[PDB]
């Protein structure tokens, strides 16, 4: 029975899970976009969002500095968090990353994801896009919407 | 079939050469000063051919060549590859039979629109390797019928009853030094000005560049 259990059992135990998630998060902060097994990226995604919020507290916040020092195992990334990444997301309140499934890994056929901080300098990922508004279906719906708007005014 | 045999007192004895000694360039519009010089070299070479066979008559050859041509092309209808090796050279046998290993050929000789005319005679460099070859180019202008069927017996090219005119410049070669040598088809000169062959029956897709992800398409 695992009702309401919100975290995965990964690595070699609970400290090992954190150390795995920390190593992944450190890589995401350096490279802005990493690929890794899908469930670990899913598990790590929550922490990557929380790290930005601590960065938005500022480097003079002792608690945020203590949090960043734990989570970023390469220390040049601590100034990057507070001075690059967090100012990039000052307007946003959330949704700092995007995560996408990529094809299964060749060797072990593992389900995989790519995760990135939004607004990075890398070539854009080939994101999925909704059908154009000009398709047959979307033009019939567009007509429906405007007909309503006309009758709504009445 | 991969590597030529190595150094030995025994070597490969060839019965033909690789190409045309002097490539008769068919003058533009031969469908229907220097000219004198041409006949000189041919005359010099008919002499060297008679230097091995006194009885060789350049006047009777056009008719011999015609029979060789027809007989060679009637083997391709029965895949009689033993006879064919007598009528054509080892440089030519692959060119007539490789693309029809699993096809059915129906070829016919209908008529000769003009008598065949020997248009060049050239011999090989004296004592090349103890072997002397003599090549006779013959212009033929005939009507042939050709229908090629595929492995499954479906018409793949040509028509089986419609004769069409064919203008060919067929080179024959003999090994003069060889006591058992004979006159055999050696190749076919194709004039650049020759009209294009009839279209095949099926459609084709010529593929484009197979791009790697990194690579982009240059128009």
């Amino acid at each position: 029975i695992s009702h309401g259990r919100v975290f995965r059992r990964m690595g070699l135990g609970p400290e090992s899970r954190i150390h795995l998630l920390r190593n992944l998060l450190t890589g995401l902060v350096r490279h802005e976009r990493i690929e890794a097994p899908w469930a670990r990226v899913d598990e790590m995604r929550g922490y990557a969002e929380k790290l930005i919020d601590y960065g938005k507290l500022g480097d003079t916040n002792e608690r945020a500095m203590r949090m960043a020092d734990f989570w970023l195992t390469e220390k040049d990334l601590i100034p990057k968090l507070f001075q690059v990444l967090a100012p990039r997301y000052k307007d946003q309140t959330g949704g700092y990353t995007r995560m996408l499934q990529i094809p299964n890994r060749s060797l072990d056929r593992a389900k995989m994801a790519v995760i990135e901080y939004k607004g990075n300098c890398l070539p854009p990922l080939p994101l999925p896009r909704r059908d154009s508004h000009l398709t047959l279906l979307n033009q019939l719906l567009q007509g429906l919407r405007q007909d309503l708007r006309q009758s709504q005014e009445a | 079939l991969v590597i030529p045999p190595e150094k030995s007192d025994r070597s490969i004895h060839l019965a033909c050469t690789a190409g045309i000694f002097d490539a008769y360039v068919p003058p533009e519009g031969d469908a229907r000063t220097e000219r004198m010089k041409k006949t000189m070299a041919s005359q010099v070479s008919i002499r060297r051919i008679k230097d091995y066979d006194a009885n060789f008559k350049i006047k009777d050859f056009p008719e011999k060549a015609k029979d060789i041509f027809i007989e060679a092309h009637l083997c391709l209808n029965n895949s009689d590859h033993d006879r064919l090796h007598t009528l054509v050279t080892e440089h030519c046998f692959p060119d007539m039979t490789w693309d029809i290993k699993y096809k059915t050929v129906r070829w016919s000789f209908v008529e000769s629109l003009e008598p065949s005319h020997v248009v060049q005679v050239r011999c090989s460099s004296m004592m090349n390797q103890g072997n002397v070859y003599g090549q006779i180019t013959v212009r033929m202008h005939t009507r042939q019928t050709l229908a090629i069927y595929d492995r499954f017996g479906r018409l793949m090219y040509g028509q089986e009853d419609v004769p069409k005119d064919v203008l060919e410049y067929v080179v024959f070669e003999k090994q003069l030094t060889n006591p058992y040598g004979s006159w055999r088809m050696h190749t076919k000169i194709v004039p650049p000005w020759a009209p294009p062959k009839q279209p095949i029956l099926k459609t084709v897709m010529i593929p484009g560049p197979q791009l790697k992800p990194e690579e982009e398409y240059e128009e």
Binding site: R109 | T104, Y149, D150, R151, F152, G153, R154, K202, T203
Partner: protein, 166 residues
């Protein structure tokens, strides 16, 4: 060993008469001595039986089994073979008419157990066989309907004789 599958592309049919319908092209291809169980290969060979060439390539491209990539390599060179050497017109106008695995020649190794015991380990090899036929894939046979059942039942009722009498 036997290598009969490789000789089936060497059959030459006589030219068809003008009235006969076009004979479809048939391309036999195989790959010998794959490092894979024939039993596992069987499922991929079964998967694509009756598919269009393109359906089979699609289904194998997104399969996780090692056998899928090998069968996909075989299917693509058999498709190339078909249009280049067997006078097929459209490379997509092909379907899997036959698709099966066979046992390869296998090796034997020692597997060590405890207490000085051991088993004999068979390093396994298989063959994949595919026959492509020109044309659209044949439609799947419709499921038997209640009408066809009733017709067949009544037919059995009408064929019964009087048994063991005059």
């Amino acid at each position: 060993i036997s290598r009969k599958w490789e000789k089936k592309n060497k059959i030459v049919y006589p030219p068809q008469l003008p009235g006969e319908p076009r004979r479809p092209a048939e391309i036999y291809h195989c790959r010998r001595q794959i490092k894979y169980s024939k039993d596992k290969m069987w499922y991929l060979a079964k998967l694509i039986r009756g598919m269009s060439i393109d359906q089979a390539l699609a289904q194998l491209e997104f399969n996780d089994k090692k056998g899928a990539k090998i069968i996909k390599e075989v299917l693509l060179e058999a498709q190339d073979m078909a249009v280049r050497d067997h006078n097929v017109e459209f490379r997509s106008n092909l379907y899997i008419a036959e698709s099966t695995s066979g046992r390869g020649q296998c090796l034997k190794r020692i597997r060590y157990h405890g207490r000085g015991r051991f088993g004999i380990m068979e390093k396994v090899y298989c063959h994949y066989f595919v026959k492509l036929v020109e044309g659209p894939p044949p439609p799947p046979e419709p499921p038997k309907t209640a009408v066809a059942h009733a017709k067949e039942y009544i037919q059995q009722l009408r064929s019964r004789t009087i048994v063991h009498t005059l």
